[PDB]
């Protein structure tokens, strides 16, 4: 049973990147996947994706440009207080100069730097760098 759909999407992205491809076909295509890929676009780790209406949860075709090296979900969307954001960034991101802990706040799904700018924090979705 597909429990965490975003996990499947990011796993497909990782597999299709490690093999060097430039495209992925993510099947279930929820809101959260769309927002995750939109954040990745805003920061450039992804290219030009596409939603394919099925009337059936839709699908997504993702274009890459090799700039990304790893996605990944934190499957238990831990409640992250504004104090623990730095802890997650240290534990997940490889360096302080880049990388982004994509986390879901009451103000939408945002990268950790943007959430720290709004001075709001919520649950953690995943990480990209």
């Amino acid at each position: 049973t597909r429990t965490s759909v975003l996990a499947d999407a990011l796993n497909a992205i990782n597999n299709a990147e490690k093999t060097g491809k430039r495209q992925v076909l993510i099947r279930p295509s929820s809101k959260v996947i769309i927002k995750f890929l939109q954040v990745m676009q805003k920061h450039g780790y992804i290219g030009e994706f596409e939603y394919i209406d099925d009337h059936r949860s839709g699908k997504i075709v993702v274009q890459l440009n090799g700039r990304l090296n790893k996605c990944g979900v934190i499957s238990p969307r831990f409640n992250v207080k504004i104090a623990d954001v730095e802890k997650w960034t240290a534990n997940l991101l490889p360096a302080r100069q880049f990388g982004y802990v994509i986390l879901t706040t009451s103000a939408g799904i945002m990268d950790h730097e943007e959430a720290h700018r709004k001075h709001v924090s919520g649950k953690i979705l995943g990480f990209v760098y």
Partner: protein, 151 residues
């Protein structure tokens, strides 16, 4: 590809066409289709056989495309929906058949295990239909009382 109660992994199914609206070539009327559905139900047919008949002998791709309502929903609007939902009824029919086969020959252990599987499935479906209040909250499946519902 789950096959809840076995090791199967098949995905044999049907792909509903993208267009929800009526097919261009269909000339029948929605009111006539609903009348046909009502007549078939009055003949004593479950919704699945009604859909099969409308797909084979007539141009009805599916009721929801043509009318806008589902077959069981259409029957319920006219008050012909059976007191026991069709899939659960067929499960009880199968269970009573296997129990008959068992009580007519004891040593068959494989059919005993299959009866256990069927009863587990019956319990699951009954729990679902009970949490949606289709069945009364006192409704339960019992081995002795299943025959009366089947018969």
């Amino acid at each position: 590809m789950g096959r809840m109660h076995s090791k199967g992994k098949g995905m044999s199914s049907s792909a509903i066409p993208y267009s929800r609206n009526a097919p261009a070539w269909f000339k029948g009327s929605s009111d006539g289709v609903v009348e046909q559905i009502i007549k078939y139900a009055r003949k004593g047919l479950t919704p699945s056989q009604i859909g099969v008949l409308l797909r084979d002998a007539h141009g009805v791709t599916q009721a929801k495309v043509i009318t806008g309502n589902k077959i069981l929903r259409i029957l319920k609007s006219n008050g012909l929906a059976p007191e026991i939902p069709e899939d659960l009824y067929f499960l009880i029919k199968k269970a009573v058949s296997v129990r008959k086969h068992l009580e007519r020959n004891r040593k068959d252990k494989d059919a005993k295990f299959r009866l256990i599987l069927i009863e587990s499935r019956i319990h699951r479906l009954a729990r679902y239909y009970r949490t949606v209040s289709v069945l009364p909250p006192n409704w339960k499946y019992e081995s002795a009382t299943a025959s009366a519902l089947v018969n």
